[PDB]
Amino acid sequence: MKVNPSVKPICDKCRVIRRHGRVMVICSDPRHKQRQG
Amino acid sequence: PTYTPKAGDTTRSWYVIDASDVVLGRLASAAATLLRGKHKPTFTPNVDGGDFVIVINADKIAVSGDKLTKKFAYRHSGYPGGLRKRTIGELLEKHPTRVVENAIIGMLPHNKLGRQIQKKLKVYAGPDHPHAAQQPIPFEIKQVAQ
Amino acid sequence: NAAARANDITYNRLIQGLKAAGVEVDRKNLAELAVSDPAAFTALVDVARAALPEDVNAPS
Amino acid sequence: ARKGILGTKLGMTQVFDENNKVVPVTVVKAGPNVVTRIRTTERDGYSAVQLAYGEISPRKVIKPVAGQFAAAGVNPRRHVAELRLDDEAAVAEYEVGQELTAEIFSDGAYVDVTGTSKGKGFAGTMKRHGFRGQGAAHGAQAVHRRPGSIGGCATPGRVFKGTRMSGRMGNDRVTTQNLKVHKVDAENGVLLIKGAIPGRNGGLVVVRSAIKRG
Amino acid sequence: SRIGKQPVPVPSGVDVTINGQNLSVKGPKGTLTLDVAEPISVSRAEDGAIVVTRPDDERRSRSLHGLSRTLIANLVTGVTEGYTQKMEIFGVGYRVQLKGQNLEFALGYSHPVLIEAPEGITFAVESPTKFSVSGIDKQKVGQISAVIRRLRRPDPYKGKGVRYEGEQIRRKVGKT
RNA sequence: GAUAACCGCUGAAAGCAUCUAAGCGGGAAACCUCUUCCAAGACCAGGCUUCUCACCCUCUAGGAGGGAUAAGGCCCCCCG
RNA sequence: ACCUCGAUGUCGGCUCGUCGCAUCCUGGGGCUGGAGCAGGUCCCAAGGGUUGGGCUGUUCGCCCAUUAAAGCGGCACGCGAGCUGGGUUUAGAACGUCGUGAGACAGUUCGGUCUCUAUCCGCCGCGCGCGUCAGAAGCUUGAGGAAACCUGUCCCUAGU
Numbered sequence: 001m002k003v004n005p006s007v008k009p010i011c012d013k014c015r016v017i018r019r020h021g022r023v024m025v026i027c028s029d030p031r032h033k034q035r036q037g
Numbered sequence: 038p039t040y041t042p043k044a045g046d047t048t049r050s051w052y053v054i055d056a057s058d059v060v061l062g063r064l065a066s067a068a069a070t071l072l073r074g075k076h077k078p079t080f081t082p083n084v085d086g087g088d089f090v091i092v093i094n095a096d097k098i099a100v101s102g103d104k105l106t107k108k109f110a111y112r113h114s115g116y117p118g119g120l121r122k123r124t125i126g127e128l129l130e131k132h133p134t135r136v137v138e139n140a141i142i143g144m145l146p147h148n149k150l151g152r153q154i155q156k157k158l159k160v161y162a163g164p165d166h167p168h169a170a171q172q173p174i175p176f177e178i179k180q181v182a183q
Numbered sequence: 184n185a186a187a188r189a190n191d192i193t194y195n196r197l198i199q200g201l202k203a204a205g206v207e208v209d210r211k212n213l214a215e216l217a218v219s220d221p222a223a224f225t226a227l228v229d230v231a232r233a234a235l236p237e238d239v240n241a242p243s
Numbered sequence: 244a245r246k247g248i249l250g251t252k253l254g255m256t257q258v259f260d261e262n263n264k265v266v267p268v269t270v271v272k273a274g275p276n277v278v279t280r281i282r283t284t285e286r287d288g289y290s291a292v293q294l295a296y297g298e299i300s301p302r303k304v305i306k307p308v309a310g311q312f313a314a315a316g317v318n319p320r321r322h323v324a325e326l327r328l329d330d331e332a333a334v335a336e337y338e339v340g341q342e343l344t345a346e347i348f349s350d351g352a353y354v355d356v357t358g359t360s361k362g363k364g365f366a367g368t369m370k371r372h373g374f375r376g377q378g379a380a381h382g383a384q385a386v387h388r389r390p391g392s393i394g395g396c397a398t399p400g401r402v403f404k405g406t407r408m409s410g411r412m413g414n415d416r417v418t419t420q421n422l423k424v425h426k427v428d429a430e431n432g433v434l435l436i437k438g439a440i441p442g443r444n445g446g447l448v449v450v451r452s453a454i455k456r457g
Numbered sequence: 458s459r460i461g462k463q464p465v466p467v468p469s470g471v472d473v474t475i476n477g478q479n480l481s482v483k484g485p486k487g488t489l490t491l492d493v494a495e496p497i498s499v500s501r502a503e504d505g506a507i508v509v510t511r512p513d514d515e516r517r518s519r520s521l522h523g524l525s526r527t528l529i530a531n532l533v534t535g536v537t538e539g540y541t542q543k544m545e546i547f548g549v550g551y552r553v554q555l556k557g558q559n560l561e562f563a564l565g566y567s568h569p570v571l572i573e574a575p576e577g578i579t580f581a582v583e584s585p586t587k588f589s590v591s592g593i594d595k596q597k598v599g600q601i602s603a604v605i606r607r608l609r610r611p612d613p614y615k616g617k618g619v620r621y622e623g624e625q626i627r628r629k630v631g632k633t
Numbered sequence: 634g635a636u637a638a639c640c641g642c643u644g645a646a647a648g649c650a651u652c653u654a655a656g657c658g659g660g661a662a663a664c665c666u667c668u669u670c671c672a673a674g675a676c677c678a679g680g681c682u683u684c685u686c687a688c689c690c691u692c693u694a695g696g697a698g699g700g701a702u703a704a705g706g707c708c709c710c711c712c713g
Numbered sequence: 714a715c716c717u718c719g720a721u722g723u724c725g726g727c728u729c730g731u732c733g734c735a736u737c738c739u740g741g742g743g744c745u746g747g748a749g750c751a752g753g754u755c756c757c758a759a760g761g762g763u764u765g766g767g768c769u770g771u772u773c774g775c776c777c778a779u780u781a782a783a784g785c786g787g788c789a790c791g792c793g794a795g796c797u798g799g800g801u802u803u804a805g806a807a808c809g810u811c812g813u814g815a816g817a818c819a820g821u822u823c824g825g826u827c828u829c830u831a832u833c834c835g836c837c838g839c840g841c842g843c844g845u846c847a848g849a850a851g852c853u854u855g856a857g858g859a860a861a862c863c864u865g866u867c868c869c870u871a872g873u
C-alpha cells in the first residue's frame with residue numbers, strides 16, 4: 001500500500017475509486033495499490 | 038408596579054412528552070421551555086414557576102447524521118489523563134436517559150435556580166412512568182405559525 | 184409572548200397587528216393585561232390578527 | 244459456584260511436602276458459619292449469601308442486631324458478611340440456618356483470601372510509596388528522606404490529584420489471589436494455606452474459591 | 458437502471474409472495490426473505506415475472522433500483538438451483554476431510570484447523586484435496602468460502618493453500 | 634464487546650468493474666467490559682431489613698418553646 | 714523589544730513526576746528487487762517497558778559490558794520558599810596575550826557564605842458539624858473514580 005496525498009493510476013489496468021471517503025487506486029498488480037492520505 | 042409572584046401564586050402542572058421518533062435537540066428545547074416556565078404569562082426570571090416534565094421512551098429518541106457514532110460525551114475525573122469519552126450510541130445503550138438528560142440540562146441556565154429547575158425533570162427509558170398519581174397531561178411539540 | 188402564543192399568535196405578528204389596528208397600548212400595560220385580565224388580552228389578539236395582511240409573507 | 248467461608252488467621256508455620264519440599268503455610272481457623280440471610284434478585288436486586296461467624300455473648304449483641312438473628316432463627320454471631328454470588332441457581336444451594344465448615348474446600352484448591360492489612364500509621368514517602376530519598380552525604384542538606392519536587396512550574400501552577408505523598412498507611416482491605424490450600428483439617432476445622440494472608444493474627448478473613456484459577 | 462429495468466423470470470415451480478416492502482420467495486430448496494429499500498417499488502408481471510421500478514431518476518433511486526433487481530434475482534436463483542463454490546487445495550501434505558457438519562483441514566500448522574458450518578450451509582469433500590461449499594444464500598456461501606480462502610497466507614512462491622476451482626493466483630520465482 | 638490499519642462477502646449508480654452507495658462479516662498490548670481497591674455529600678443524598686415505636690409542662694388553642702425518656706450513642710474507666 | 718530591572722536566581726546532576734506521538738521494544742497489517750532465517754519501506758497502535766559502568770562540571774559525544782529495547786520531545790531548555798553547587802559570572806592569586814599605565818581577555822588556572830516558623834489556592838492524610846422528612850442499628854447496590862497492564866530464554870511441533 002502506498003499512502004500519499006497524490007494517487008495516480010500507474011498503469012492502464014489501474015482504476016480510481018472512492019471508498020469510505022478516501023480516494024483509492026485498485027489494481028491487479030499489488031504494487032499499484034494506493035490510498036490517499 | 039409590574040406584577041410579581043407572591044407566596045401562594047405559583048401553580049404547577051404535570052406534562053408528559055413522548056420522545057419516540059423525536060429529534061433530540063427539538064425535544065430538549067421544548068422540555069427546557071416548559072421546565073423554565075417560559076410559556077406562562079406569570080414568568081419571572083428570578084422565580085421558578087416551571088412545570089414538571091416527564092419524558093418517556095427516551096431510548097427511542099432520534100439523532101440525525103453520523104452523530105450516533107461521532108458525537109462524543111466527554112467527562113474529566115480531575116486526575117491527569119482522566120478524560121473519558123463515550124459516543125451517543127454507546128451512551129444510549131448503557132444509560133438511555135442520560136442522553137436526553139444531558140441535552141435538557143445544557144439548555145437550562147447554569148445557576149442555582151437552574152439546579153432547582155432540574156428537580157422537576159423526570160426521564161424514563163420505557164413507555165411507562167410511576168407518576169400516574171399526578172395525572173400528567175400529554176404534551177405535543179407544536180409550532181405556532183406566523 | 185407567552186400570552187400571545189397561548190392565543191396561537193407569535194409576539195412579532197401581535198405587535199405588527201396592534202400597530203396596524205392603531206392600538207397604542209404600550210408593553211407595560213399589555214403585560215399587565217396578559218397577567219391580570221386574560222379575556223381583555225384575548226380580545227386584543229383578535230383585533231391584531233384581523234388587522235394583519237392576508238398574506239404576511241407577500242410583498243408590501 | 245464460588246464457595247466461601249469466614250475465618251480467623253491463627254498464625255504461620257511450616258509443613259513438608261511428600262517430596263520433602265518445605266511449604267510455608269498460614270493457618271486459618273475456618274470456623275463454622277451459619278447462613279443468616281439470602282439475598283435474591285427479586286428482593287434485593289442481586290444474589291448473595293449472608294454468613295455469620297464467631298461466638299458472642301447475647302449480653303453483647305445490640306437489640307436491632309438480635310432482632311435480625313431472631314428473624315433468621317439462629318443464635319447471634321460477632322461477625323456478619325456477605326458473599327456475592329453470580330446467579331440465583333448458586334443461591335439455591337443455600338438455606339437459612341445451614342452450617343458451613345472448612346470441608347467445603349478440598350486439598351489443592353486455589354483460594355483468594357481477603358483481610359484487613361496491618362496498620363502502619365502515618366508513613367513517609369520512602370516507606371509508603373518506595374521513594375528513593377536523597378544522598379546521605381555530598382552536601383545534601385536535611386532532605387535525606389524528603390520527597391523532592393511535587394510539580395512543574397507556572398504551568399500548570401498546581402499539584403495534580405494522585406500525587407504520591409506521606410500519610411496514613413495500612414489497615415486496607417486486601418485480597419491475595421490464587422493461594423493453594425495445602426491441607427484441610429476437618430477435626431480442628433482448619434485450613435493450611437500456602438503463603439501469606441493479609442492481617443494480624445486473630446483478624447477476620449474471608450476465604451473464597453479463586454476466580455482466576457477456580 | 459439498465460440492470461433494474463430487466464424483469465426477473467419466475468419458473469412455474471417457484472412461488473413468489475409480495476407483501477409491501479417485505480418479499481418472501483419459496484422454492485424447492487426452501488424459503489428466502491428479502492427487504493427492498495423504501496423508495497424502490499416491487500411489482501409482479503401476472504404473466505409470471507418480477508418487475509422492479511423506481512419513482513425518480515434521482516441518484517439514490519437509480520442506485521437502489523439496479524441493486525434490488527439483482528438481489529431478488531439472486532434470491533430466485535438460490536431457491537431454484539442453489540449456490541455451490543468449488544474449491545481446491547494445493548501443496549504437499551495439505552488435506553481436507555469432513556467430520557460430520559464440520560470441516561477439518563491440515564494446512565501445515567502444528568494444530569489442525571476446524572471450521573464449523575453455520576446454519577444453512579453444507580460442506581462436501583470429493584477428494585482429500587478437492588471440496589465444495591453449498592447453500593441457499595449467495596452471501597452466506599461467499600462469506601464462508603472467503604474465510605476458508607484466507608486459512609493460509611497467499612503463497613506466490615510455491616502456490617500452496619486453498620484456492621477457488623478456476624483460481625489463477627499471482628506467481629513469482631524466489632531464485633535464492 | 635465495540636473498533637484501528639488491513640482483509641472481505643453480497644452489489645448498483647455505470648449491461649463491465651467496484652469492500653459501499655442499501656445491507657452483512659473478520660480484525661491489535663490502544664478503547665468498553667473483565668481483575669484489585671475507594672465509593673450514596675451519587676442533593677435522583679439509593680436498597681434489604683431489625684429495634685424503639687413513649688410522656689409531661691407553658692404560651693394560645695397557630696405554630697412554637699422547654700423538660701424528662703426509649704432503642705441507641707457519647708464521655709469517664711481497663712486496653713490494643 | 715510587548716510583560717517583568719521599588720528582583721521572574723543560571724548550566725549540569727539529584728528527587729519527584731505529568732503530557733504529546735513525529736514509536737526504540739513488545740502488539741496488528743499492506744508492498745517488497747519478501748525462497749527460508751534475517752531485513753527494507755509504508756500504514757495502525759501511547760497499555761506497559763525503555764540497564765549498569767569508564768572519561769568530562771558538563772549537556773552532547775566517544776567507549777566498555779549487557780538488553781526485547783537501551784525512543785524523540787513539551788511542561789519558566791518541568792522541578793534551588795525540594796537538595797546539590799563541579800562549570801559560568803563579585804572581591805584573592807598566577808600563566809599566556811593585549812595596554813606606557815590603571816587595567817583587560819565567550820583564553821586558561823587554584824580558591825571562594827545557597828536565607829525564610831506556609832496566610833491563601835493546590836496536593837496527601839485525619840477529624841468536627843449539619844443534611845439525606847421520626848430517633849437508631851446490621852448488612853448492602855454501584856452512578857462515578859483510582860490502581861494494575863513489561864518481557865526473555867530453553868524444550869516440543871521440527872532438523873519438518
Ligand SMILES: [Mg+2]
Pocket residue numbers: 384385
Ligand atoms: Mg541547614
Ligand SMILES: [Mg+2]
Pocket residue numbers: 383384385386387
Ligand atoms: Mg543531614
Ligand SMILES: [Mg+2]
Pocket residue numbers: 679
Ligand atoms: Mg440511605
Ligand SMILES: [Mg+2]
Pocket residue numbers: none
Ligand atoms: Mg469522641
Ligand SMILES: [Mg+2]
Pocket residue numbers: none
Ligand atoms: Mg516600538
Ligand SMILES: [Mg+2]
Pocket residue numbers: none
Ligand atoms: Mg514588587
Ligand SMILES: [Mg+2]
Pocket residue numbers: none
Ligand atoms: Mg502514528
Ligand SMILES: [Mg+2]
Pocket residue numbers: 760
Ligand atoms: Mg488496556
Ligand SMILES: [Mg+2]
Pocket residue numbers: none
Ligand atoms: Mg529548567
Ligand SMILES: [Mg+2]
Pocket residue numbers: none
Ligand atoms: Mg522553585
Ligand SMILES: [Mg+2]
Pocket residue numbers: none
Ligand atoms: Mg582579581
Ligand SMILES: [Mg+2]
Pocket residue numbers: none
Ligand atoms: Mg608590556
Ligand SMILES: [Mg+2]
Pocket residue numbers: none
Ligand atoms: Mg579550601
Ligand SMILES: [Mg+2]
Pocket residue numbers: none
Ligand atoms: Mg573554580
Ligand SMILES: [Mg+2]
Pocket residue numbers: none
Ligand atoms: Mg574566579
Ligand SMILES: [Mg+2]
Pocket residue numbers: 855857
Ligand atoms: Mg462504576
